[PDB]
Design brief:
Largest sheet of chain A: 7 strands, parallel
Helix content of chain A: 40-55%
Protein name (chains B, C): CDP-glucose 4,6-dehydratase
Strand order of the largest sheet of chain A: 3-2-1-4-5-7-12
Organism (chains B, C): Salmonella typhimurium (strain LT2 / SGSC1412 / ATCC 700720)
Distance between the termini of chain A: 11 Å
Number of helices of chain A: 14
Pathway (chains B, C): Nucleotide-sugar biosynthesis; CDP-3,6-dideoxy-D-mannose biosynthesis; CDP-3,6-dideoxy-D-mannose from CTP and alpha-D-glucose 1-phosphate: step 2/5; Bacterial outer membrane biogenesis; LPS O-antigen biosynthesis
Order of helices and strands of chain A: HEHEHHEHEHHEEHEEHEEEHEEHEEHHH
Structural class of chain A: alpha/beta
Largest interface: A-B, 30 and 31 residues
Number of domains of chain A: 2
Keywords (chains B, C): Lipopolysaccharide biosynthesis, Lyase, NAD
CATH topology of the largest domain in chain A: Rossmann fold
Strand content of chain A: 5-15%
GO molecular function, one term (chains B, C): CDP-glucose 4,6-dehydratase activity
Bound molecules: adenosine-5-diphosphoribose, cytidine-5'-diphospho-beta-D-xylose
CATH architecture of the largest domain in chain A: 3-Layer(aba) Sandwich
Oligomer: homotetramer
Chain lengths: 350, 352, 352, 350
């Protein structure tokens, strides 16, 4: 499914390469022989996987704002990629509330900017627009969303993603009609609850837990019974890649929306998770706070990807966790993270 | 019904007051005793109703860009309105195809700005967000859309309205939540009108203006899609709907803080051809038309919610409406007093 | 439009011809020159229009049960009709609650029988399956249902129609497939009408009959649900729709072999109260009403498909309709010649 | 999830007990201590699991037609069950075409008959109405149906099931409103592609294959690439039981529709299946015919059951198959099938 030779030598432009996912993706792709260029603001964190693995060496990197159409246009045109991965985004919900303007301009205008650039420039066979599992109108039900369902979003962040999804659709219809020449294939990819090593995001369950353990402090669990479709970073990333390959060779036929996610079977509680974590950590412990600990959850239906891309996730919760834990320790102990990160990909690739 | 007394003295801020809808609204509103402050770019066209009726002299007209947050916020801040009508937009289809970015920035970020501005300023009781009949994902089918259907849009303009709809519901949810109404005091409604036609519209590529211009200049009008259908309606119709909701939001914010369609009666949802044929007839004196980028074929709106829930109904019929547009255009032509004609239409409507 | 010439000489088999709808249909049909054979149980009520207009003497009326397959099949077989209207049913709500089994057997198996009979007999060109406006899952909302919405039904009657709808589409799919049209030659449509009201209906618990009976006997009519809404329409309205489709199915079976709603214009979908108030007025002479098992509150039908696709539109308004029912009832009362009055209404409608 | 003690001593009335599923269910339930009564026509086949395991000994059995309301009413009233499983049905699609009247009267009128009886009689806490995965309006898509989707069915059999589903709904609304006393809890259960030992149905993939092998003849595979949500007979049956328990103790809250099915992950091709079969058989072989062998499939979304009943399937395709094969051999060799059948349940129960 993931063809190395395919990647070998491809001029790939990725927006938002300095962040978590962008860095894992850029790595992989370079690991594979692709000629990458990144366009983003400086690493969103400290530490930052981007830096930790010294990616500016392995790839061309442009620091810039998605909101500068011209600069953005320029940067791409100079490059002439053939493949584009769009991931620059203001990703926090929390923030989304304080900074709605920022969220929207970044998330919606940036998307518009990007597709319009791709449009004006020309010579792009494949664009993979990264949105979110939150783009969907939230019915607060037990069911996993299908790609044909309505967009929305309750908070600014989620809502911004539903808009980005509308944008990609209109761009596709207006400018890259599959039904017709331009040679541009455009897919919007949806996924969430992404976990792995290199995630220095603040107020994130995994990161937290790890910081906690690392600093020997015990963890306060706010809601033990909460369930999420937790998935290793590489899982969705593989979907994106494959999708990119398909868009490339097959075009139009895959120019559409696509959900990436774990098996329902693989859904664990926060409590379960922290427990495993603990065990996994060794050294590690946690506590239940005084808030309300309530007993449905947002999920995606992956039938279309399984079925039409033959895509399937590879690691089970436990494995992923351990791999997460192991990668953290390595880091902490001063191991070469580029290498370990590399093996991580390698392993997933088997 | 519209309440002239409710309007008296009200501080009303209207974005996009320089346009077709804006001008008619501002005129209506000032005529009712309201204190209106507009914020838009210079008149979209020439001629322009704004200019034609000298509205600038009957209101506080401020020239500015919706994309300039800071400037927008200030404008609002200094006036402290109690009511707001957000109508500024790049409202054209074919153009949106040519200028995608300006369309989205204007329509989308402009809405965000306006709503963020409303949030920061405070003491605003009612917010009426004007979107479009094009916000709905178009299934190209025989049925009028319901408020509960999915947002979308094929072209950048349609799609930008779809996004504007999403934006308002997220602001509503996160910041003007009916739950915490007492905490914010904000009523916010998204209003979706049909295809407004009336005397005083110079917009490019629109049907009636197109028609009026050709007729005027003893030329035949060029028809691109004779069998398309739109929810045709006198410009004053949805305006009445907008006004009514503002009234209701003023006192029962929580309750009417949602989406509303304002369109004609189903029988008024005719084809392009029908209109042009009628218009030819209405004009007379040689009038003729002639047959010639993705546009929707069918577009209808189901208005049972406003009918039942707001108890709002349309006043004029398509034919009556066409007749009135003609009369208006000609009067203008003969150099009649348009402010006076325009005032007359509002009054007649109020009587209808 | 209805085609009197198309009708002439046609062998038409009508199940449930003894009823209200049936009688009006049979009358219409024979009046057009058609050769009608009915198959139903004895008149549903007394009085009965069937009896009142002596239809039995103007057609081949056969008394039989839809649940008796063999008997039904035979009846059809011996007549070899070219057209079929399936209207036999236990059509009442409250009753269905009391008699669930008879309701389902009649409505469901009766449809199966009829369709299986049509299959075995052959040479039938058009089949018009009358279901009900109650076939749709009722979401209790402001919107008229579209042909493409889900079937359901809360009570046994509603639900039996939902099942009757499913049955016809499965027969269509499996046995009268548009694909193999040339192989079977069968056109089959499911028609969903509104709430028919007209002179000549004695059905139990129905509104207008209820009203007419009380008025008649200088008593007040007892109203159970004043604010409910139904798609009120003169009985001749949907009939026209049924007739029109049969015409079309006759020659373009494949093409019109689907579901169709036949209802009034949206403005005619008023409440119970409105009707009774109007009726009081129409009747006069002391007329009054008085306020008093699960029934739907709101029920409307979206008819854009028939409007656009069959080009069918309703002729009379609710008020006109109410007026005509009154006139009819009274004439009857004074001992006027009902066949003649009834013939007159059909003619007037044909003129409308 | 399946409580033995619960079952112990329950007066349970099952319609369609002589057939495949009815016999497995009746067994289990008796295995568990329930006092069962069956109401059905004579065994639909030869051999017949019903006979093979000598069920008339283990349970009360009434031979009768579902279409005789009175008799049916009588039979239940005499019994006073507290739990009712409704499974009498004309189950063949093939037949459904030749015998539409039969199918409908049986499938729809029988259902009406049954619910009305339950109604008139009284004293039934739980009714489990067995429909089919085919009750749904078939959208010919990749997605698994949700319980809230529209009913229909293309052929008479499928369509008959969509009607039965409408019937149960109306009965529930009209007569057993959850929202209100009567103490009747009514669930409609949907499932299909049910496989296992004891299935003597003609023109059924598994049965066939087994007959074939058994008679040393080689098998002709019409469509190798076809995919179905194949599941061991006991899988759905467990759902039914549990559902029954819930309806019983909790009532109304579970008075609704429910889908039972396998994990998507567990979807195999006919070819795959026959291969495994072969291997599994030993002795065994097959051939591809001359028809068209084409490359979406009807499936159900089981989120509601997983989530709200905590229900999950237990055996994987392979296992099920083997168990199928093993049970067949046992039979053939003259082993006591009641016993083996018994162990089958026992095993599933672990
Ligand atoms: N205005 C901007 N211009 C350019 N790049 C930007 C801008 N704002 C943010 N970015 C870049 O976007 C990335 C954000 O990365 P993270 O905070 O690590 O978030 P990540 O988990 O990578 O999220 C990427 C985005 O796509 C979805 O996968 C995800 O949910 C999120 O919304 C970084 O490359 C960051 O510099
Ligand atoms: N960036 C901008 N900043 C401020 N005002 C703007 C901007 N872009 C457009 N406007 C203002 O928007 C108005 C547009 O008016 P018209 O072109 O006449 O369009 P109209 O038919 O009045 O549309 C009014 C409103 O109703 C909706 O149907 C339509 O989308 C628009 O939102 C004018 O006052 C114009 O200056
Ligand atoms: N088992 C039966 N066998 C044969 N005919 C039957 C049977 N049950 C009822 N009928 C016939 O059905 C007809 C019912 O007529 P009405 O009670 O007057 O009802 P009407 O208002 O005419 O309904 C006609 C049709 O339109 C639908 O709205 C309604 O459900 C029915 O299908 C009568 O001719 C009656 O004898
Ligand atoms: N008219 C009838 N009256 C009574 N019982 C009947 C009647 N017709 C069929 N049955 C009984 O129904 C059962 C049919 O069993 P099978 O042919 O083995 O089919 P099975 O796989 O058990 O299917 C049961 C039914 O429910 C669903 O699970 C399934 O898809 C099928 O429609 C037997 O008990 C049979 O005697
Ligand atoms: N010469 C011409 C002109 C027009 N036409 C056809 O008439 C119809 C109406 O088009 P317009 O008047 O431009 O209105 P729009 O419906 O695009 O959007 C309008 O109504 C909805 C609002 O939201 C939007 O802002 C406003 O521009 C279309 O099918 C168009 O192709 C034709 O066939 N020949
Ligand atoms: N005294 C009375 C009588 C009636 N009503 C109300 O008037 C409405 C109309 O009821 P009915 O005339 O009985 O018509 P139905 O709509 O039940 O079905 C009818 O129309 C649809 C057809 O399919 C069906 O066969 C036919 O019976 C209901 O809300 C009823 O409760 C009231 O408030 N007081």
């Amino acid at each position: 499914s993931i063809d190395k030779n395919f990647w070998q030598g491809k001029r790939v432009f990725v927006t938002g390469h300095t962040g978590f996912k962008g860095s894992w993706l850029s790595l992989w792709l370079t690991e594979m022989g692709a000629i990458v260029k990144g366009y983003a603001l400086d690493a969103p964190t400290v530490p930052s996987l981007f830096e930790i693995v010294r990616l500016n060496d392995l790839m061309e990197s442009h620091i810039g704002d998605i909101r500068d159409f011209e600069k953005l246009r320029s940067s791409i045109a100079e490059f002439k990629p053939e493949i584009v991965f769009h991931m620059a985004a203001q990703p926090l919900v929390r923030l989304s509330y304080e900074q709605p303007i920022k969220t929207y301009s970044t998330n919606v205008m940036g998307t518009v900017h990007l597709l319009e650039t791709v449009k004006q420039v020309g010579n792009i066979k494949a664009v993979v627009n990264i949105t979110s599992d939150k783009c969907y109108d939230n019915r607060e039900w037990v069911w996993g969303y299908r790609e044909n369902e309505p967009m929305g979003g309750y908070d600014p962040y989620s809502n911004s993603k539903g808009c980005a999804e509308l944008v990609a659709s209109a761009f596709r219809n207006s400018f890259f009609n599959p039904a017709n020449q331009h040679g541009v294939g455009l897919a919007s990819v949806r996924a969430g609850n992404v976990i792995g090593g290199g995630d220095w995001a603040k107020d994130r369950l995994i990161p937290d837990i790890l910081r906690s353990f690392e600093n020997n402090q015990q963890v306060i669990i706010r809601n033990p019974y909460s369930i999420r479709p937790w998935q290793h970073v590489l899982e969705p990333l593989s979907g994106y890649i494959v999708v990119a390959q398909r868009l490339y060779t097959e075009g139009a036929k895959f120019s559409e929306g696509w959900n990436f996610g774990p098996r329902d079977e693989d859904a664990k509680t926060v409590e379960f998770i922290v427990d495993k974590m603990v065990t996994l950590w060794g050294d590690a412990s946690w506590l239940l706070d005084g808030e309300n600990h309530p007993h449905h959850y947002l999920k995606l239906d992956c039938s279309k990807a399984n079925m039409q891309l033959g895509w399937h996730p590879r690691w089970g919760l436990t494995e992923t966790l351990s791999r997460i834990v192991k990668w953290h320790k390595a880091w902490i102990r001063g191991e070469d993270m580029l290498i370990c990160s590399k093996r991580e990909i390698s392993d997933y690739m088997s």
